[PDB]
Amino acid sequence: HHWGYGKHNGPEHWHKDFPIAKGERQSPVDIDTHTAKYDPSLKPLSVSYDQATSLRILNNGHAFNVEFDDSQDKAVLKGGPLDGTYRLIQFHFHWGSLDGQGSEHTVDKKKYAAELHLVHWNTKYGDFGKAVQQPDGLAVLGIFLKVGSAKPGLQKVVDVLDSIKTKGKSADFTNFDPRGLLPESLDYWTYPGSLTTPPLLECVTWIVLKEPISVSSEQVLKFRKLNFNGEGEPEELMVDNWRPAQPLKNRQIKASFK
Ligand SMILES: [Zn+2]
């Protein structure tokens, strides 16, 4: 009876195995744009992805991850609200069964069709497993997807999903450039939060970009053909793998822009 997104093991049940689900800095949250505070001391984001080395794409049974070589400072995030250098380790998405839902964060209660998470870890802790035990261990860049025109930089991801349809399948996935997934503007909101899947650790500085990227209906439709289950098990479509918004409690969301 492992955790998942179904009726009997979904997010409303996670607190029984992971009691930090009712913690003080859980994610995602609703971003109220009128009570976010403009902070003029926030620095612009520095995204340095020109030497990124992708390695593999994997269906882990709740999402698919594109994994990167994080043994050197090749694809790093700096600046913004961060102190120090954060290395890119993987990205993944959350999406819905319908275009009107799928994102984890919401903006004035508005849901997007999907949400991209680029996960980075603080190099001063030496490896990802150590970083997740620290309050400043991870920085996650969150990008909203809306349905409209196609995103050409996403198509290489879409076309290999047939090869990793079921849980535990992986495929070689080299020379993918994550710069093709970024919007034009890097204006952002930021707040302290958590991983949005178990173990739900409160180790994340969230950086949520204001500008969504557009993807086509055909692109998101191919996300919905993946399976939660392993091969040879009954088919359950991988859809609605998003956690609902959690209470903000004693946190303030800051904005880099007026
Ligand atoms: Zn995520």
PDB file of C-alpha atoms and ligand atoms in Angstrom:
ATOM      1  CA  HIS A   1       0.000   0.000   0.000  1.00  0.00           C
ATOM      2  CA  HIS A   2       2.567   2.585  -1.146  1.00  0.00           C
ATOM      3  CA  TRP A   3       1.812   6.269  -1.598  1.00  0.00           C
ATOM      4  CA  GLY A   4       0.409   7.574  -4.851  1.00  0.00           C
ATOM      5  CA  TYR A   5      -2.365   9.725  -6.307  1.00  0.00           C
ATOM      6  CA  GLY A   6      -5.402   7.424  -6.128  1.00  0.00           C
ATOM      7  CA  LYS A   7      -8.537   7.336  -3.992  1.00  0.00           C
ATOM      8  CA  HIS A   8      -6.997   5.273  -1.193  1.00  0.00           C
ATOM      9  CA  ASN A   9      -3.352   6.411  -1.229  1.00  0.00           C
ATOM     10  CA  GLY A  10      -3.435   9.975  -2.542  1.00  0.00           C
ATOM     11  CA  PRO A  11      -2.249  13.220  -0.964  1.00  0.00           C
ATOM     12  CA  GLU A  12      -4.949  13.257   1.742  1.00  0.00           C
ATOM     13  CA  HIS A  13      -3.434  10.003   3.092  1.00  0.00           C
ATOM     14  CA  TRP A  14       0.268  10.895   2.987  1.00  0.00           C
ATOM     15  CA  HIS A  15       0.409  12.228   6.569  1.00  0.00           C
ATOM     16  CA  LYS A  16      -0.061   8.703   7.985  1.00  0.00           C
ATOM     17  CA  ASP A  17       3.357   7.600   6.672  1.00  0.00           C
ATOM     18  CA  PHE A  18       4.972  11.054   6.473  1.00  0.00           C
ATOM     19  CA  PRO A  19       3.863  13.285   9.420  1.00  0.00           C
ATOM     20  CA  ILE A  20       5.765  16.326   7.970  1.00  0.00           C
ATOM     21  CA  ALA A  21       2.863  16.534   5.450  1.00  0.00           C
ATOM     22  CA  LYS A  22       1.076  18.717   8.114  1.00  0.00           C
ATOM     23  CA  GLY A  23       4.272  20.743   8.696  1.00  0.00           C
ATOM     24  CA  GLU A  24       4.890  24.475   8.784  1.00  0.00           C
ATOM     25  CA  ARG A  25       6.457  24.976   5.337  1.00  0.00           C
ATOM     26  CA  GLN A  26       4.778  22.545   2.978  1.00  0.00           C
ATOM     27  CA  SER A  27       4.382  22.998  -0.786  1.00  0.00           C
ATOM     28  CA  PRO A  28       2.699  23.771  -3.133  1.00  0.00           C
ATOM     29  CA  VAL A  29       0.827  26.963  -2.177  1.00  0.00           C
ATOM     30  CA  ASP A  30      -1.512  29.407  -3.846  1.00  0.00           C
ATOM     31  CA  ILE A  31       0.343  32.544  -4.924  1.00  0.00           C
ATOM     32  CA  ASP A  32      -1.849  35.540  -4.059  1.00  0.00           C
ATOM     33  CA  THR A  33      -0.427  38.148  -6.428  1.00  0.00           C
ATOM     34  CA  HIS A  34      -1.844  41.080  -4.492  1.00  0.00           C
ATOM     35  CA  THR A  35      -0.283  40.146  -1.139  1.00  0.00           C
ATOM     36  CA  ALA A  36       3.091  39.022  -2.472  1.00  0.00           C
ATOM     37  CA  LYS A  37       5.715  41.571  -1.437  1.00  0.00           C
ATOM     38  CA  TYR A  38       7.984  43.192  -3.997  1.00  0.00           C
ATOM     39  CA  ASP A  39      11.524  42.877  -2.600  1.00  0.00           C
ATOM     40  CA  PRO A  40      13.931  45.234  -4.412  1.00  0.00           C
ATOM     41  CA  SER A  41      16.919  43.512  -2.804  1.00  0.00           C
ATOM     42  CA  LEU A  42      16.223  40.286  -4.715  1.00  0.00           C
ATOM     43  CA  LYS A  43      18.840  39.697  -7.394  1.00  0.00           C
ATOM     44  CA  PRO A  44      18.135  38.542 -10.946  1.00  0.00           C
ATOM     45  CA  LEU A  45      18.325  34.811 -11.497  1.00  0.00           C
ATOM     46  CA  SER A  46      21.501  33.447 -13.075  1.00  0.00           C
ATOM     47  CA  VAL A  47      20.801  30.302 -15.106  1.00  0.00           C
ATOM     48  CA  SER A  48      23.940  28.758 -16.604  1.00  0.00           C
ATOM     49  CA  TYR A  49      22.831  25.695 -18.590  1.00  0.00           C
ATOM     50  CA  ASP A  50      25.151  25.864 -21.622  1.00  0.00           C
ATOM     51  CA  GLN A  51      27.244  22.856 -20.515  1.00  0.00           C
ATOM     52  CA  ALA A  52      24.360  20.709 -19.215  1.00  0.00           C
ATOM     53  CA  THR A  53      24.830  16.955 -19.779  1.00  0.00           C
ATOM     54  CA  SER A  54      21.604  14.970 -19.769  1.00  0.00           C
ATOM     55  CA  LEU A  55      21.975  11.237 -19.242  1.00  0.00           C
ATOM     56  CA  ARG A  56      18.721   9.322 -18.935  1.00  0.00           C
ATOM     57  CA  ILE A  57      14.942   9.547 -18.779  1.00  0.00           C
ATOM     58  CA  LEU A  58      13.140   7.344 -16.263  1.00  0.00           C
ATOM     59  CA  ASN A  59       9.540   6.471 -15.359  1.00  0.00           C
ATOM     60  CA  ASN A  60       9.695   6.191 -11.550  1.00  0.00           C
ATOM     61  CA  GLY A  61       6.003   5.381 -11.110  1.00  0.00           C
ATOM     62  CA  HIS A  62       4.819   8.876 -10.197  1.00  0.00           C
ATOM     63  CA  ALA A  63       6.377  11.067 -12.924  1.00  0.00           C
ATOM     64  CA  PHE A  64       9.161  10.851 -15.480  1.00  0.00           C
ATOM     65  CA  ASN A  65      12.560  12.349 -14.595  1.00  0.00           C
ATOM     66  CA  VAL A  66      15.200  13.595 -17.012  1.00  0.00           C
ATOM     67  CA  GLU A  67      18.499  13.103 -15.169  1.00  0.00           C
ATOM     68  CA  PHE A  68      21.694  15.119 -15.508  1.00  0.00           C
ATOM     69  CA  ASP A  69      25.367  14.620 -14.676  1.00  0.00           C
ATOM     70  CA  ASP A  70      25.738  16.539 -11.392  1.00  0.00           C
ATOM     71  CA  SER A  71      29.346  15.524 -10.616  1.00  0.00           C
ATOM     72  CA  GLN A  72      30.689  18.941 -11.730  1.00  0.00           C
ATOM     73  CA  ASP A  73      29.406  22.526 -11.982  1.00  0.00           C
ATOM     74  CA  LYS A  74      28.046  22.154 -15.510  1.00  0.00           C
ATOM     75  CA  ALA A  75      24.415  23.296 -15.215  1.00  0.00           C
ATOM     76  CA  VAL A  76      24.007  25.626 -12.250  1.00  0.00           C
ATOM     77  CA  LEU A  77      21.557  28.096 -10.769  1.00  0.00           C
ATOM     78  CA  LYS A  78      22.771  31.133  -8.810  1.00  0.00           C
ATOM     79  CA  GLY A  79      21.570  34.573  -7.869  1.00  0.00           C
ATOM     80  CA  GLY A  80      17.985  35.396  -7.079  1.00  0.00           C
ATOM     81  CA  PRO A  81      17.299  34.651  -3.409  1.00  0.00           C
ATOM     82  CA  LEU A  82      20.068  32.047  -3.242  1.00  0.00           C
ATOM     83  CA  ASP A  83      23.448  32.055  -1.552  1.00  0.00           C
ATOM     84  CA  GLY A  84      25.921  29.834  -3.313  1.00  0.00           C
ATOM     85  CA  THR A  85      25.770  27.532  -6.286  1.00  0.00           C
ATOM     86  CA  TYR A  86      23.056  24.942  -6.940  1.00  0.00           C
ATOM     87  CA  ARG A  87      23.607  22.061  -9.410  1.00  0.00           C
ATOM     88  CA  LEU A  88      20.864  20.753 -11.704  1.00  0.00           C
ATOM     89  CA  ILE A  89      20.170  17.059 -11.003  1.00  0.00           C
ATOM     90  CA  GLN A  90      16.823  16.341 -12.728  1.00  0.00           C
ATOM     91  CA  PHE A  91      13.623  17.827 -14.068  1.00  0.00           C
ATOM     92  CA  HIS A  92      10.104  16.398 -14.124  1.00  0.00           C
ATOM     93  CA  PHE A  93       6.508  17.505 -14.661  1.00  0.00           C
ATOM     94  CA  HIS A  94       3.143  17.290 -12.936  1.00  0.00           C
ATOM     95  CA  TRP A  95       0.036  17.284 -15.134  1.00  0.00           C
ATOM     96  CA  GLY A  96      -3.702  16.744 -15.200  1.00  0.00           C
ATOM     97  CA  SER A  97      -6.304  14.558 -16.828  1.00  0.00           C
ATOM     98  CA  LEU A  98      -7.840  17.731 -18.341  1.00  0.00           C
ATOM     99  CA  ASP A  99      -6.306  20.982 -19.568  1.00  0.00           C
ATOM    100  CA  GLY A 100      -7.922  22.911 -16.697  1.00  0.00           C
ATOM    101  CA  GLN A 101      -5.835  21.259 -13.975  1.00  0.00           C
ATOM    102  CA  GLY A 102      -2.400  19.801 -13.465  1.00  0.00           C
ATOM    103  CA  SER A 103      -0.172  22.399 -11.899  1.00  0.00           C
ATOM    104  CA  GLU A 104       0.780  22.233  -8.229  1.00  0.00           C
ATOM    105  CA  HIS A 105       1.172  25.917  -7.530  1.00  0.00           C
ATOM    106  CA  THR A 106      -1.741  28.158  -8.426  1.00  0.00           C
ATOM    107  CA  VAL A 107      -1.791  31.889  -9.157  1.00  0.00           C
ATOM    108  CA  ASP A 108      -4.798  33.676  -7.663  1.00  0.00           C
ATOM    109  CA  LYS A 109      -6.415  30.194  -7.533  1.00  0.00           C
ATOM    110  CA  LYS A 110      -5.850  29.736 -11.301  1.00  0.00           C
ATOM    111  CA  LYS A 111      -4.573  26.227 -12.264  1.00  0.00           C
ATOM    112  CA  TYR A 112      -2.369  25.589 -15.286  1.00  0.00           C
ATOM    113  CA  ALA A 113      -2.317  22.443 -17.435  1.00  0.00           C
ATOM    114  CA  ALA A 114       1.046  21.291 -16.057  1.00  0.00           C
ATOM    115  CA  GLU A 115       4.044  22.398 -14.037  1.00  0.00           C
ATOM    116  CA  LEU A 116       7.734  21.802 -14.772  1.00  0.00           C
ATOM    117  CA  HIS A 117      10.165  21.419 -11.840  1.00  0.00           C
ATOM    118  CA  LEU A 118      13.922  21.836 -12.389  1.00  0.00           C
ATOM    119  CA  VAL A 119      15.543  20.446  -9.233  1.00  0.00           C
ATOM    120  CA  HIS A 120      18.938  21.766  -8.038  1.00  0.00           C
ATOM    121  CA  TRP A 121      21.026  21.056  -4.942  1.00  0.00           C
ATOM    122  CA  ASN A 122      23.372  23.243  -2.907  1.00  0.00           C
ATOM    123  CA  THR A 123      26.960  22.259  -3.686  1.00  0.00           C
ATOM    124  CA  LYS A 124      28.194  23.063  -0.199  1.00  0.00           C
ATOM    125  CA  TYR A 125      26.507  19.868   1.043  1.00  0.00           C
ATOM    126  CA  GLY A 126      28.416  17.636  -1.392  1.00  0.00           C
ATOM    127  CA  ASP A 127      25.609  15.420  -2.687  1.00  0.00           C
ATOM    128  CA  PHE A 128      21.853  15.442  -3.137  1.00  0.00           C
ATOM    129  CA  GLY A 129      21.145  13.038  -0.272  1.00  0.00           C
ATOM    130  CA  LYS A 130      22.884  15.337   2.214  1.00  0.00           C
ATOM    131  CA  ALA A 131      21.334  18.485   0.750  1.00  0.00           C
ATOM    132  CA  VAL A 132      17.765  17.305   1.339  1.00  0.00           C
ATOM    133  CA  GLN A 133      18.419  17.222   5.101  1.00  0.00           C
ATOM    134  CA  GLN A 134      19.188  20.972   5.185  1.00  0.00           C
ATOM    135  CA  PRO A 135      16.806  23.950   5.246  1.00  0.00           C
ATOM    136  CA  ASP A 136      18.670  25.544   2.307  1.00  0.00           C
ATOM    137  CA  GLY A 137      19.569  22.322   0.523  1.00  0.00           C
ATOM    138  CA  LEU A 138      17.464  22.505  -2.664  1.00  0.00           C
ATOM    139  CA  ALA A 139      16.305  25.143  -5.113  1.00  0.00           C
ATOM    140  CA  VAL A 140      13.445  24.194  -7.429  1.00  0.00           C
ATOM    141  CA  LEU A 141      12.612  26.319 -10.452  1.00  0.00           C
ATOM    142  CA  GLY A 142       8.906  25.985 -11.244  1.00  0.00           C
ATOM    143  CA  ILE A 143       7.514  26.833 -14.673  1.00  0.00           C
ATOM    144  CA  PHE A 144       3.818  26.773 -15.615  1.00  0.00           C
ATOM    145  CA  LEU A 145       2.587  25.220 -18.871  1.00  0.00           C
ATOM    146  CA  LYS A 146      -0.514  26.485 -20.649  1.00  0.00           C
ATOM    147  CA  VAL A 147      -2.067  24.888 -23.726  1.00  0.00           C
ATOM    148  CA  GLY A 148      -1.636  26.863 -26.938  1.00  0.00           C
ATOM    149  CA  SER A 149       1.138  26.842 -29.530  1.00  0.00           C
ATOM    150  CA  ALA A 150       3.624  23.983 -29.494  1.00  0.00           C
ATOM    151  CA  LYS A 151       6.968  24.258 -27.709  1.00  0.00           C
ATOM    152  CA  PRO A 152       9.620  22.921 -30.121  1.00  0.00           C
ATOM    153  CA  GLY A 153      12.184  22.355 -27.369  1.00  0.00           C
ATOM    154  CA  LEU A 154       9.840  19.916 -25.615  1.00  0.00           C
ATOM    155  CA  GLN A 155       9.287  17.608 -28.579  1.00  0.00           C
ATOM    156  CA  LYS A 156      12.396  15.479 -27.997  1.00  0.00           C
ATOM    157  CA  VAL A 157      10.994  14.651 -24.539  1.00  0.00           C
ATOM    158  CA  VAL A 158       7.527  13.871 -25.929  1.00  0.00           C
ATOM    159  CA  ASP A 159       8.862  11.537 -28.618  1.00  0.00           C
ATOM    160  CA  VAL A 160      10.727   9.192 -26.214  1.00  0.00           C
ATOM    161  CA  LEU A 161       7.812   8.679 -23.809  1.00  0.00           C
ATOM    162  CA  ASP A 162       6.697   5.574 -25.736  1.00  0.00           C
ATOM    163  CA  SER A 163       9.933   3.889 -24.624  1.00  0.00           C
ATOM    164  CA  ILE A 164       9.336   4.452 -20.877  1.00  0.00           C
ATOM    165  CA  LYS A 165       5.587   3.846 -20.652  1.00  0.00           C
ATOM    166  CA  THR A 166       5.585   1.782 -17.454  1.00  0.00           C
ATOM    167  CA  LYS A 167       7.138   2.133 -14.003  1.00  0.00           C
ATOM    168  CA  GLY A 168      10.854   1.352 -13.767  1.00  0.00           C
ATOM    169  CA  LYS A 169      11.634   1.719 -17.472  1.00  0.00           C
ATOM    170  CA  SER A 170      14.516   3.984 -18.478  1.00  0.00           C
ATOM    171  CA  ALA A 171      16.124   5.112 -21.715  1.00  0.00           C
ATOM    172  CA  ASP A 172      19.344   6.833 -22.716  1.00  0.00           C
ATOM    173  CA  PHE A 173      18.593  10.520 -23.177  1.00  0.00           C
ATOM    174  CA  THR A 174      21.728  12.463 -24.097  1.00  0.00           C
ATOM    175  CA  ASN A 175      22.343  15.945 -25.501  1.00  0.00           C
ATOM    176  CA  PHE A 176      19.042  17.451 -24.339  1.00  0.00           C
ATOM    177  CA  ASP A 177      19.310  21.207 -23.794  1.00  0.00           C
ATOM    178  CA  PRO A 178      17.043  22.463 -20.964  1.00  0.00           C
ATOM    179  CA  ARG A 179      17.378  26.044 -22.203  1.00  0.00           C
ATOM    180  CA  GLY A 180      14.627  25.156 -24.684  1.00  0.00           C
ATOM    181  CA  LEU A 181      12.119  24.982 -21.812  1.00  0.00           C
ATOM    182  CA  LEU A 182      12.600  28.479 -20.379  1.00  0.00           C
ATOM    183  CA  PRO A 183      10.245  31.430 -20.919  1.00  0.00           C
ATOM    184  CA  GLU A 184      11.454  34.781 -22.191  1.00  0.00           C
ATOM    185  CA  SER A 185      11.304  36.549 -18.819  1.00  0.00           C
ATOM    186  CA  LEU A 186      12.900  35.316 -15.591  1.00  0.00           C
ATOM    187  CA  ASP A 187      10.709  37.391 -13.237  1.00  0.00           C
ATOM    188  CA  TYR A 188       9.781  35.216 -10.278  1.00  0.00           C
ATOM    189  CA  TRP A 189       8.080  34.671  -6.949  1.00  0.00           C
ATOM    190  CA  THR A 190       9.984  32.968  -4.146  1.00  0.00           C
ATOM    191  CA  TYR A 191       9.097  31.380  -0.802  1.00  0.00           C
ATOM    192  CA  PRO A 192      10.491  28.654   1.520  1.00  0.00           C
ATOM    193  CA  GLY A 193       8.804  25.273   1.100  1.00  0.00           C
ATOM    194  CA  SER A 194       9.077  21.536   0.689  1.00  0.00           C
ATOM    195  CA  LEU A 195       9.297  18.675  -1.747  1.00  0.00           C
ATOM    196  CA  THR A 196       5.806  18.035  -3.088  1.00  0.00           C
ATOM    197  CA  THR A 197       6.198  14.242  -3.046  1.00  0.00           C
ATOM    198  CA  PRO A 198       7.192  12.011  -0.127  1.00  0.00           C
ATOM    199  CA  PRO A 199       9.345  12.332   1.848  1.00  0.00           C
ATOM    200  CA  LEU A 200       7.997  15.957   1.721  1.00  0.00           C
ATOM    201  CA  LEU A 201      11.155  17.307   3.351  1.00  0.00           C
ATOM    202  CA  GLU A 202      11.238  21.037   4.138  1.00  0.00           C
ATOM    203  CA  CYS A 203      14.444  21.775   2.273  1.00  0.00           C
ATOM    204  CA  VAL A 204      13.365  23.787  -0.803  1.00  0.00           C
ATOM    205  CA  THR A 205      13.732  27.417  -1.787  1.00  0.00           C
ATOM    206  CA  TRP A 206      10.993  27.695  -4.399  1.00  0.00           C
ATOM    207  CA  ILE A 207      11.499  29.960  -7.413  1.00  0.00           C
ATOM    208  CA  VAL A 208       8.287  30.108  -9.461  1.00  0.00           C
ATOM    209  CA  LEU A 209       8.480  31.963 -12.769  1.00  0.00           C
ATOM    210  CA  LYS A 210       5.664  34.410 -13.572  1.00  0.00           C
ATOM    211  CA  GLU A 211       5.625  33.755 -17.339  1.00  0.00           C
ATOM    212  CA  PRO A 212       4.247  30.375 -18.481  1.00  0.00           C
ATOM    213  CA  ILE A 213       5.429  28.478 -21.519  1.00  0.00           C
ATOM    214  CA  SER A 214       2.904  27.327 -24.119  1.00  0.00           C
ATOM    215  CA  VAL A 215       2.695  23.698 -25.245  1.00  0.00           C
ATOM    216  CA  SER A 216       0.279  22.201 -27.719  1.00  0.00           C
ATOM    217  CA  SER A 217      -2.679  19.985 -26.867  1.00  0.00           C
ATOM    218  CA  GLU A 218      -0.958  17.120 -28.712  1.00  0.00           C
ATOM    219  CA  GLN A 219       2.153  17.505 -26.570  1.00  0.00           C
ATOM    220  CA  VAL A 220       0.340  17.302 -23.234  1.00  0.00           C
ATOM    221  CA  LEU A 221      -1.872  14.464 -24.531  1.00  0.00           C
ATOM    222  CA  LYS A 222       1.207  12.276 -24.867  1.00  0.00           C
ATOM    223  CA  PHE A 223       2.031  12.874 -21.173  1.00  0.00           C
ATOM    224  CA  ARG A 224      -1.348  11.293 -20.331  1.00  0.00           C
ATOM    225  CA  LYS A 225      -0.488   8.015 -22.087  1.00  0.00           C
ATOM    226  CA  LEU A 226       2.141   7.065 -19.492  1.00  0.00           C
ATOM    227  CA  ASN A 227       1.350   4.466 -16.810  1.00  0.00           C
ATOM    228  CA  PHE A 228       1.656   4.532 -13.015  1.00  0.00           C
ATOM    229  CA  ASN A 229       1.900   0.719 -13.057  1.00  0.00           C
ATOM    230  CA  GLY A 230       4.703  -1.616 -14.038  1.00  0.00           C
ATOM    231  CA  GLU A 231       4.663  -3.752 -17.159  1.00  0.00           C
ATOM    232  CA  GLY A 232       2.340  -6.726 -16.876  1.00  0.00           C
ATOM    233  CA  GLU A 233       0.241  -5.053 -14.173  1.00  0.00           C
ATOM    234  CA  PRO A 234      -3.256  -3.609 -14.736  1.00  0.00           C
ATOM    235  CA  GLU A 235      -3.054  -0.323 -16.619  1.00  0.00           C
ATOM    236  CA  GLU A 236      -3.527   2.911 -14.692  1.00  0.00           C
ATOM    237  CA  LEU A 237      -2.912   6.093 -16.648  1.00  0.00           C
ATOM    238  CA  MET A 238      -0.394   8.537 -15.164  1.00  0.00           C
ATOM    239  CA  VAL A 239      -2.623  11.616 -14.799  1.00  0.00           C
ATOM    240  CA  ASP A 240      -3.350  14.092 -11.997  1.00  0.00           C
ATOM    241  CA  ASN A 241      -0.001  13.511 -10.296  1.00  0.00           C
ATOM    242  CA  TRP A 242      -0.225  16.859  -8.507  1.00  0.00           C
ATOM    243  CA  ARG A 243      -0.512  17.727  -4.816  1.00  0.00           C
ATOM    244  CA  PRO A 244      -3.149  20.322  -3.865  1.00  0.00           C
ATOM    245  CA  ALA A 245      -2.182  23.666  -2.355  1.00  0.00           C
ATOM    246  CA  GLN A 246      -1.212  23.687   1.315  1.00  0.00           C
ATOM    247  CA  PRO A 247      -1.688  26.429   3.930  1.00  0.00           C
ATOM    248  CA  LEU A 248       0.808  29.279   3.807  1.00  0.00           C
ATOM    249  CA  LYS A 249       0.953  29.567   7.615  1.00  0.00           C
ATOM    250  CA  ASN A 250       3.715  32.032   8.763  1.00  0.00           C
ATOM    251  CA  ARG A 251       5.408  32.556   5.361  1.00  0.00           C
ATOM    252  CA  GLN A 252       5.563  35.578   3.065  1.00  0.00           C
ATOM    253  CA  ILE A 253       5.834  35.176  -0.752  1.00  0.00           C
ATOM    254  CA  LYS A 254       8.240  37.692  -2.262  1.00  0.00           C
ATOM    255  CA  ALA A 255       8.264  38.953  -5.851  1.00  0.00           C
ATOM    256  CA  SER A 256      11.235  40.072  -7.953  1.00  0.00           C
ATOM    257  CA  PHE A 257       9.021  42.433  -9.957  1.00  0.00           C
ATOM    258  CA  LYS A 258       6.485  45.200  -9.425  1.00  0.00           C
TER     259      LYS A 258
HETATM  260 ZN    ZN B   1       7.767  18.177  -8.731  1.00  0.00          ZN
END
